[PDB]
Design a protein around this ligand. Structure first.
Ligand code: BCL
Ligand code: BCL
Ligand code: BCL
Ligand code: BCL
Ligand code: BCL
Ligand code: BCL
Ligand code: BCL
Ligand code: CLA
Ligand SMILES: CCCCCCCCCCCCCCCC(=O)OC[C@@H](CO[C@H]1O[C@@H](CO)[C@H](O)[C@@H](O)[C@@H]1O)OC(=O)CCCCCCCCCCCCCCC
Ligand SMILES: CCCCCCCCCCCCCCCC(=O)OC[C@H](COP(=O)(O)OC[C@@H](O)CO)OC(=O)CCCCCCCCCCCCCCC
Ligand code: SF4
Ligand SMILES: [Ca+2]
Lengths: 119, 654, 357, 47, 121, 20, 61
């Protein structure tokens, strides 16, 4: 099921990972590295670790201050804040698994793919 | 935009128009007439048919000296003159029932915008009307007031009309001709016509020229309603002050002083008791033992008005009522007023208002200087007088090798002011300075609401704005920021006010204020009356007040129930005023899960309740209400237990 | 004896990227239905299972069990809808239509194409939450029905004869298709039904008996009000369908009134609103515009309670009309402004009610 | 050195401001940002 | 809030009453004069049960009307309060006490002097 | 004078520190 | 005394079991980093008096 508050971080209900860099290779494939909230090891989104995401054992997120996020996140973030210190707001986007495309980010009612999303 | 869908904000000025306001006011004066007609039925000492009347109630005692003054009620000891009185009170109770029903009808249709009368088959216009036909056409040039400023003239006229009507009522129905000498009730008819002339003349001067003062008050209903409440509260305080000096004047003796001579049978007072083995039969008591044997079993016993001191008890119950409210309405006028100053600072109309009632305090520079003068004067006065009371307490308890000779017995009001007190003494010098200190203390919380509704000299420093009026705090940041909204500053005005609101209760019950301990059997407590040549023996000292006044409370089975209930309500305010809101939120979660678990195991069907917890701002609300209601549910017991000051001082015990 | 209607609503949402929400609705109304025949009762069931998430195919089912003026009426549908592209969506399904002692089955091979008259970047940039989207839809239909009854055989011929002898069959068929006040509804929602096109009407033998086979095409355009066109991507959360989703509802109607019971979970109840904020999906406009058609015949007083339950840690940033009460996680709407909005939208109004959590 | 960087995850913040008081007062990096009633998470911190 | 939920409250009240009645037959307490052994415990339990029951109904009743009051209660709430106050004053003179204090002979005493004379003799 | 004023409140904070 | 012990025992069982986390704060996704922290601020209708030092005060009171 789920581990207790005492095991790992207490705030987390499932283990938490953050995509920290999204550089590309010579062939243009997106090399995604995600480190856990503790942050002492580097992993890539392999099927075995995606398989955890199907059962909710882990959760993946992206910061909006990432150096290579490709999409102009600050302008859109600034607009929403103005709708309802505005600059320096930072958010965590919850990455989800789409069987057809793999990891997608439902940003502003529009599904995206990590390769489409990142530079 | 903070939520305003709470049940206690349903009748807010934002949710009502000018026409609805009139309907709301009318929908209450009709209820008030229904209430006034019940305070009249209860006051029937003997029924018209000869059946015995109603036992004394405090709701009719505070109005009995007035109905006696107007002739509806009499103080006669004879049933024949007490059987007519009963018929009259029935007449005015039924009359107030009829007039109240009209005002409620004229409030229901006013509230629903449905101004149609069946007989005339024509609907009137709120925007413009002739006002009582030709009478209004001659005076208001055939038009009606178009704004609050233009309503002053017509509103003043209405006041003149009401005064003229009261004068006609006293002359024709009550038989009091207008004789202009100020020792008789007949002078209340003469001045009912002088006032009707002043107001009518004043009501015409304001209709031809509407007042330009506070022009912004026309724009918002809450802005004008709050200035009226800051004014009505001061008026009410003045009425309480005036009723204390007047109700015990020689000219008011036939109505207030006369109460002492009567025997009163209040409900819930000591009654003829009975033995455990009591078996009452119709004809006579059998195999039972009953106390007194002068009244029937379980019959309220008499009470000597003179021993009780009912003339001063009734004077206090009325004087304190119009002061407990007068200061509550001053606090609410500033609150509901600063509640409007938050909106003009949020939507930014503040810097463009030319009124000197908003322009004078525009700059923060003056604000700190004004608040720094209220704050400095409160310090130099709440200390100067507290150290006198503490020193007087030390000197008479013989603490630190001191005696009642070294106390402040030689300090009293100056000769210029001596006319203000029947008997001048340090008890009078202290009371004036305590009220002065007690006003400047709660004024600090009021100057804060007026000046710091949105931004303070500290928040402007900390880079923060107060977006709401009912926000509990900004978290634990900067060591903590709790109680910073104006609703919380209103609470700290009500809470701080309880001291001057108690220096009045104590001082009008004939207690000593110049010493925490007066009249106790200690070294110099009983040496006050002769060290200062007091012509009166004050009931007790600040602390010894609780012991003496409560001897009569414990003897009553109903005054003691109030004591219990009032204390129970008051400490419960601690639960919602302590910083345990986070703890309550967790606790409840355990209760919901616990109850869910118990229901689950115990019954096949699983039922959950999700126990709720109040918010801090919702906590400080129920907190002040439980603290204030509890604190003055019991102040009533001090005033209604009797007036036990005496005109004979005590010689030194030696 | 006063027109009074009582209703209860409930939405429970999960946290994370989940768009899953549970919706329950009960209603009670005291005015007669605008139906020339009473009593008319009806139960509807819709179940969507994740047949193939890899390719993108789901198995949707629908059962209609309605008794109209003592006449049992049933319609059953089982179909396989999947996303082909952004504008095309093919469905393969079977169903059966029974009225009293009559019944006939059908099989269909169909595709729907949805195009927007324009797609501009400026509209997307300057309008954070667009409502009105002008578009058109095209249906390719291949109907196949086994004609094993005399009554079914007679309907099959008459149609061919009518096409053969009447030139205006493509036009006058719209009149027959939208029976009763259904045709009026077209103009009401700003929806235009184009003329049908018959590719072929050929009888093809089947193992059971002669089977009528039809292959037709049609189109219909929405001024923006229509939700099928304006919201084509949002009405099919196939990819968000990890677990089977079911919507169950039913209603009883007669001279005395209407009682409605609706319940079920499905994705798409919550959609991203920008700036990290989530929001309840914009109310469908077609149902409101379609109910104003029958809801304006009897004056009434509203008694509606809308209980909304949010995920742990999730608090409203803004709502108009504002929630009457807030029991922490669960917020409540009743009375005041909300009762004003319910009377608005029950009579055909489409005024916005926003919740941002 | 300015090698490492620090951030507020705004959806997670509850605005308690414990972070703000650790920041040196001559370097007013952390600050407050209001958009609603505080009892409804209407305020957050940001560097 | 149906079936066993309300069934449970009735069962609990009956159990508490039986326990209070049962404990007495073994508590060994002398009964008051002209009182039944079975009645004393039954009367005490009913008073205890009423206090919690009255407190519980008042707590949920105030809660029910705190979130169900609006502009529509503008006239009804003030009228209902007046009606309760009125049915209350009538009870003072129709159930709590019948008439003003009178003596065995039926005479009245309305003056301090009349009282003083009564006290002495 | 804001900075100097804030160095004080910071000198009396709710965070971990040494107390007498 | 039985009621007066079980009352102040509630504040003691909470110090023993909820020193770092509670069922509510695991739900609200929060950590009690500290034993003497006053509240987390106005958030969630407020959360004052949640540390174990405050639960000690509510046992003494
Ligand atoms: C008690 C200390 C304060 C006080 C504190 C508050 C607070 C706190 C609130 C109001 C609010 C209101 N106040 Mg105020 N108010 C006081 C004195 C008054 C007086 C007066 C008798 O002179 C009047 C006419 C008003 C008028 C009003 C309305 C403009 C508004 C909504 C009333 C409502 O729905 O009540 C509830 C309706 C009922 C039928 C319940 C019974 C109310 C009875 C009739 C008394 C009315 C006044 C009373 C204080 C209203 C609030 C009760 C709450 C429990 C605090 N206040 C004093 C000075 N007032 C609200 C608002 O929107 O302010 C901007 C609000 O949040
Ligand atoms: C009502 C507005 C539009 C309409 C809207 C759509 C939409 C939208 C699409 C279809 C598509 C199709 N349409 Mg079409 N369609 C209309 C008119 C028609 C008519 C006709 C009798 O005139 C026909 C024969 C068809 C035929 C067809 C099919 C070929 C195909 C799949 C239908 C299906 O499986 O339904 C199943 C049978 C049912 C009874 C379902 C009824 C569902 C109702 C309308 C809404 C229920 C959902 C509820 C609000 C939320 C539930 C969530 C649960 C998880 C289910 N359309 C009108 C003009 N049509 C689909 C396609 O793209 O295929 C490739 C599709 O996505
Ligand atoms: C002595 C006269 C007092 C006062 C005594 C009261 C009291 C007491 C009450 C009101 C009530 C109300 N008063 Mg008034 N009222 C005053 C002057 C005003 C002014 C003004 C611009 O001067 C305004 C706009 C109002 C407006 C209002 C509404 C907030 C409200 C009607 C609700 C209702 O009747 O149901 N009052 C003065 C300050 N009014 C009633 C209410 O519902 O308050 C919440 C109520 O109980
Ligand atoms: C209006 C709502 C209720 C009502 C509620 C009350 C209340 C409340 C009281 C009475 C009381 C009385 N009522 Mg009644 N009464 C009503 C209708 C009537 C009518 C009638 C014409 O229908 C009559 C003849 C009476 C008769 C009487 C007397 C038996 C008695 C003493 C009146 C008095 O002193 O008046 C004097 C009246 C005036 C002089 C009119 C002027 C009042 C002015 C406008 C107020 C100024 C005060 C203050 C300084 C304001 C300053 C601000 C501005 C600068 C002006 N009532 C209706 C049904 N009645 C009183 C009582 O029983 O006392 C024991 C009492 O307190
Ligand atoms: C004590 C009575 C209450 C009151 C209770 C009623 C009642 C009762 C009725 C109305 C209704 C009406 N109200 Mg009103 N209303 C009050 C104050 C006002 C004021 C005001 C600001 O002074 C105005 C402009 C109005 C406006 C109006 C009329 C346009 C309307 C006409 C139909 C009718 O029968 O009319 C006759 C009246 C007029 C044509 C208007 C001119 C005469 C005056 C203004 C009428 C009110 C009574 C008068 C002031 C009482 C005597 C005052 C003395 C000092 C004792 N009311 C007075 C103070 N209102 C009617 C309604 O709602 O019907 C469904 C109605 O029958
Ligand atoms: C020896 C001076 C005593 C004193 C003795 C008297 C006497 C005697 C009388 C009053 C009376 C009054 N006093 Mg005093 N009063 C003092 C200080 C104050 C302060 C104050 C906070 O500073 C205030 C607001 C008041 C308020 C008042 C009014 C109720 C009334 C006004 C006339 C008056 O003072 O006439 C006489 C005034 C003077 C002779 C000089 C006043 C000097 C001013 C007030 C400066 C003294 C303040 C001082 C700095 C406080 C020390 C604080 C320290 C820094 C710790 N007093 C000091 C403590 N007061 C009269 C009254 O009616 O009493 C019932 C009265 O007869
Ligand atoms: C007086 C004001 C009353 C009121 C007055 C009435 C009256 C009067 C009536 C209703 C009716 C209805 N009301 Mg209403 N109603 C009120 C408030 C409510 C509330 C509420 C409080 O929330 C609810 C839940 C309802 C609910 C409802 C429904 C039970 C019913 C409409 C059914 C429907 O959707 O048919 C949906 C219909 C269709 C989809 C059309 C079917 C036929 C056409 C030809 C099909 C073409 C589409 C094409 C084939 C589709 C796609 C195919 C697939 C793509 C394959 N009402 C208010 C308070 N309401 C009406 C009703 O029908 O009652 C029985 C009615 O007469
Ligand atoms: C009589 C006063 C009183 C009562 C009954 C309670 C009761 C309670 N408190 Mg509180 N509390 C009080 C005073 C009181 N407190 C004061 C003065 C403070 C300030 C120090 C606090 C501070 C406080 C905190 C910080 C917390 C509570 C919590 C709790 C609850 C946990 C105990 C429990 O589950 O059952 C205890 C047993 C009972 C409640 C039995 C009922 C006792 C009587 C019969 C209740 C009915 C009498 C009542 C006074 C009637 C009112 C009449 C009206 C005229 C006033 C409980 C509901 C905790 C909680 O979980 O919050 C929800 C919590 O975290 N208490
Ligand atoms: C809540 C927030 C702040 C608190 C203030 C609010 C309440 C104020 C409400 C006025 C309270 C008065 C009560 C009824 C009036 C009454 O009592 O008048 C008579 C007389 C004594 O009469 C006799 O009383 C006997 C009882 O023992 C005696 O034995 C006998 O010797 C004596 O003669 O009292 C004075 O002269 C009044 C003294 C106070 C003097 C007022 C000084 C204040 C003036 C200066 C400025 C103050 C304001 C500062 C700005 C805020
Ligand atoms: C077998 C049990 C299984 C698990 C345990 C179950 C726990 C049972 C919980 C019972 C709750 C205890 C009952 C009271 C316990 C108690 O005393 O708690 C006091 C209460 C605390 O409420 P909280 O918000 O902390 O949450 C309470 C609930 O969570 C209880 O679970 O505070 C108030 O009510 C103040 C509001 C008063 C409103 C202001 C009115 C002002 C007017 C002044 C005069 C008014 C006179 C009368 C007014 C009413
Ligand atoms: S305990 Fe209450 S007042 Fe104190 S910081 Fe926390 S929320 Fe603010
Ligand atoms: Ca006393």
């Amino acid at each position: 099921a789920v581990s207790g508050p005492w095991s790992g971080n207490a705030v987390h209900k499932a283990e938490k990972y953050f995509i920290t860099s999204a550089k590309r290779d010579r062939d243009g494939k997106l090399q995604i590295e995600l480190v856990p909230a503790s942050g002492r090891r580097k992993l890539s989104p392999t099927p075995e670790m995606i398989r955890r995401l199907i059962d909710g054992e882990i959760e993946i997120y992206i910061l909006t201050t990432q150096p290579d996020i490709a999409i102009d996140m600050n302008k859109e973030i600034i607009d929403m804040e103005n709708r309802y210190g505005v600059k320096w707001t930072m958010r965590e986007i919850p990455v989800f698994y789409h069987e057809g495309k793999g990891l997608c980010v439902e940003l502003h009612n529009k599904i995206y793919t990590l390769d489409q999303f990142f530079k | 935009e903070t939520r305003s869908t709470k049940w206690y904000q349903i009748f807010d000025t934002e949710k009502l128009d000018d026409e609805q306001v009139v309907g709301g006011h009318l929908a209450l004066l009709g209820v008030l007439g229904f209430i006034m007609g019940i305070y009249y039925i209860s006051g029937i000492q003997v029924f018209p048919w000869g059946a015995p009347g109603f036992h004394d109630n405090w709701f009719y005692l505070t109005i009995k000296p007035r109905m006696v003054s107007l002739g509806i009620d009499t103080y006669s000891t004879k049933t024949a003159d007490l059987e007519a009185a009963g018929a009259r009170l029935l007449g005015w109770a039924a009359f107030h029932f009829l007039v109240g029903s009209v005002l409620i009808f004229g409030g229901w249709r006013h509230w629903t915008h449905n101004l149609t009368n069946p007989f005339t088959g024509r609907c009137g216009n709120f925007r413009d009307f002739r006002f009582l036909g030709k009478f209004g056409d001659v005076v208001f040039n055939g038009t009606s007031a178009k704004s609050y400023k233009e309503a002053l003239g017509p509103h003043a006229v209405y006041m003149s009309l009401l005064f003229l009507g009261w004068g006609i009522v006293m002359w024709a129905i009550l038989g009091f001709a207008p004789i202009p000498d100020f020792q008789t009730i007949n002078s209340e008819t003469f001045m009912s016509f002088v006032f009707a002339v002043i107001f009518f003349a004043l009501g015409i001067y304001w209709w031809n020229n509407p007042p330009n003062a506070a022009i912004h008050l026309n724009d918002d209903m809450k802005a004008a309603f709050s200035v009226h409440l800051t004014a009505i509260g001061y008026i009410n305080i003045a009425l309480g002050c005036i009723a204390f000096v007047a109700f015990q004047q020689p000219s008011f003796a036939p109505y207030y002083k006369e109460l002492d001579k009567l025997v009163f049978y209040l409900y819930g007072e000591p009654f003829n008791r009975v033995s455990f083995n009591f078996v009452e039969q119709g004809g006579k008591v059998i195999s039972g033992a009953k106390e007194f044997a002068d009244f029937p079993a379980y019959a309220i016993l008499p009470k000597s008005g003179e021993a009780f001191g009912m003339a001063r008890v009734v004077t206090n119950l009325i004087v304190f009522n119009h002061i407990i409210c007068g200061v509550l309405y001053v606090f609410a006028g500033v609150y509901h007023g600063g509640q409007y100053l938050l909106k003009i600072q949020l939507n930014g109309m503040y810097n463009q208002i030319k009124s000197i009632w908003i322009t004078k305090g525009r700059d923060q520079e003056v604000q700190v200087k004004i608040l720094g003068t209220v704050m400095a004067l409160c310090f130099a006065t709440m200390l100067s007088v507290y150290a006198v009371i503490v020193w007087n307490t030390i000197c008479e308890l013989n603490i630190f090798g001191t005696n009642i000779t070294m106390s402040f017995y030689w300090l009293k009001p100056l000769p210029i002011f001596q006319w203000m007190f029947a008997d001048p003494s340090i008890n009078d010098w202290v009371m004036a300075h305590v009220i002065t200190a007690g006003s400047l203390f709660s004024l600090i919380a009021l100057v804060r609401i007026a000046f710091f509704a949105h931004t303070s000299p500290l928040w402007d420093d900390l880079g923060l704005k107060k977006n709401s009026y009912s926000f509990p705090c900004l978290g634990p940041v900067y060591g903590g920021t709790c109680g910073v909204s104006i609703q919380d500053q209103l609470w700290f005005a009500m809470l701080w006010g309880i001291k001057g609101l108690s220096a009045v209760c104590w001082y009008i019950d004939g207690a000593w204020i110049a010493s925490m301990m007066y009249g106790v059997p200690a070294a110099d407590a009983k040496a006050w009356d002769s060290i200062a040549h007091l012509h009166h023996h004050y009931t007790s000292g600040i602390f010894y007040y609780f012991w003496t006044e409560t001897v009569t409370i414990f003897s009553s089975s109903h005054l003691s129930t109030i004591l219990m209930i009032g204390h129970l309500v008051w400490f419960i305010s601690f639960a919602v005023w302590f910083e345990d809101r986070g703890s309550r939120l967790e606790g409840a979660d355990i209760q919901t899960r616990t109850i869910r678990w118990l229901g689950k195991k115990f019954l096949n069907r699983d039922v959950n309740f999700r126990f709720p917890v109040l918010t801090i701002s919702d906590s400080k609300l129920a907190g002040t209400f439980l603290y204030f209601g509890g604190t003055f549910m019991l102040v009533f017991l001090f005033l209604a237990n009797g007036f036990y000051q005496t005109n004979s001082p005590l010689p030194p015990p030696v | 004896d006063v027109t009074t209607a009582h209703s209860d609503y409930e939405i429970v949402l999960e946290g994370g990227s989940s768009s899953w929400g549970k919706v329950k609705a009960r209603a009670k109304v005291n005015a007669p239905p605008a139906s020339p025949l009473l009593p008319a009762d009806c139960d509807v069931k819709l179940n969507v299972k994740p047949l193939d998430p890899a390719k993108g195919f789901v198995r949707i089912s629908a059962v209609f069990e309605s008794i109209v003026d003592s006449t049992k009426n049933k319609l059953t549908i089982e179909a396989d809808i999947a996303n082909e592209t952004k504008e095309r969506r093919i469905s393969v399904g079977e169903g059966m239509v029974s009225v009293g002692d009559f019944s006939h089955t059908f099989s269909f091979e169909g595709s729907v194409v949805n195009l927007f008259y324009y797609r501009s970047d400026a509209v997307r940039r300057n309008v954070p939450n667009p409502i009105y989207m002008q578009g058109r839809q095209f249906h390719d239909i291949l109907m196949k029905v086994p004609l094993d009854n005399n009554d079914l055989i007679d309907t099959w011929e008459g149609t061919v004869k009518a096409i053969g002898s009447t030139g205006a069959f493509n036009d006058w068929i719209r009149d027959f298709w939208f029976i009763g006040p259904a045709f009026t509804a077209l103009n009401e929602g700003g929806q235009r039904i184009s003329r049908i096109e018959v590719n072929g009407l050929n009888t093809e033998s089947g193992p059971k008996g002669p089977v009528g086979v039809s292959r037709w095409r049609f189109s219909h355009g929405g001024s923006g009000m229509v939700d099928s066109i304006s919201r084509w991507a949002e009405l099919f959360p196939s990819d968000k369908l990890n677990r089977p989703a079911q919507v169950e509802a039913g209603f009883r109607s007669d001279s005395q009134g209407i009682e409605v019971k609706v319940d079920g979970e499905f994705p798409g109840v919550s959609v991203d609103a920008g700036g990290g904020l989530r929001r309840i999906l914009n109310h469908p406009l077609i149902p409101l515009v379609h109910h104003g058609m029958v809801g304006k015949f009897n004056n009434f007083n509203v008694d509606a309670q809308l209980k909304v339950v949010l995920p742990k840690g999730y608090k409203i940033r803004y709502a108009a009309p504002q929630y009457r009460s807030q029991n922490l996680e669960e917020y409540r709407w009743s009375g005041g402004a909300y009762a004003r909005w319910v009377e608005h939208v029950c009579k055909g109004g489409v005024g916005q009610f926003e919740i941002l959590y | 050195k300015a090698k490492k960087h620090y951030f507020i995850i705004e959806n997670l913040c509850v605005g308690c401001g414990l972070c703000l008081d650790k920041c040196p007062p001559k370097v007013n990096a952390i600050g407050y940002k209001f958009y609603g009633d505080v009892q409804e998470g209407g305020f957050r911190c940001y560097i | 809030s149906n079936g066993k939920l309300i069934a449970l409250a009735v069962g609990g009240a009956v159990l508490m009453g039986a326990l209070f009645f049962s404990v007495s037959f073994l508590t060994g307490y002398i009964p008051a004069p002209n009182h039944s052994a079975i009645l004393t415990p039954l009367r005490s339990f009913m008073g205890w049960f009423l206090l919690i029951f009255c407190a519980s109904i008042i707590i949920m009743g105030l809660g029910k009307m705190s979130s169900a009051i609006s502009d529509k209660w503008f006239l009804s709430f003030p009228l209902s309060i007046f009606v309760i106050v009125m049915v209350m004053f009538l009870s003072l003179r129709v159930y709590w006490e019948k008439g003003r204090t009178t003596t065995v002979d039926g005479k009245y005493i309305r003056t301090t002097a009349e009282l003083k004379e009564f006290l002495n003799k | 004078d804001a900075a100097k004023m804030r160095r004080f409140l910071f000198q009396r904070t709710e965070t971990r520190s040494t107390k007498w």
